[PDB]
């Protein structure tokens, strides 16, 4: 029963929109999440300043300035 911790689940601190915030640069790849939407990022920030995670079964980019490493006191 191997689990394997892949990427980190981040909690969208503030709704994002590559249709307004983003300068419209290949947004077709960027991910559109909302406040609270959990996104699993993989790897460190790129040269630009974004993260590579997956959402609702979609791989794209996500602004680290709109996420927060999820950390809760797991008791059980």
Curated annotation (Swiss-Prot):
It is found in: Cell membrane; Synapse. It comes from the Eukaryota. Residues 8-70 form the SH3 domain. Belongs to the RIMBP family. The SH3 domains mediate binding to a proline-rich motif in RIMS1, RIMS2, CACNA1D and CACNA1B. Plays a role in the synaptic transmission as bifunctional linker that interacts simultaneously with RIMS1, RIMS2, CACNA1D and CACNA1B. Interacts with RIMS1, RIMS2, CACNA1D and CACNA1B, and potentially with other Ca(2+) channel alpha-1 isoforms. This is RIMS-binding protein 2. The gene is RIMBP2. The chain holds residues 955 to 1017 of 1052 of the full protein.
């Amino acid at each position: 029963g191997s689990s394997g911790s892949s990427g980190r689940r981040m909690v969208a601190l503030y709704d994002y929109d590559p249709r307004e915030s983003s300068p419209n640069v290949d947004v077709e790849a960027e991910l559109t999440f909302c406040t609270g939407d959990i996104i699993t990022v993989f790897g460190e920030i790129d040269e630009d300043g974004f993260y590579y995670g997956e959402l609702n079964g979609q791989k794209g980019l996500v602004p680290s300035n709109f996420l927060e490493e999820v950390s809760g006191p797991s008791s059980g």
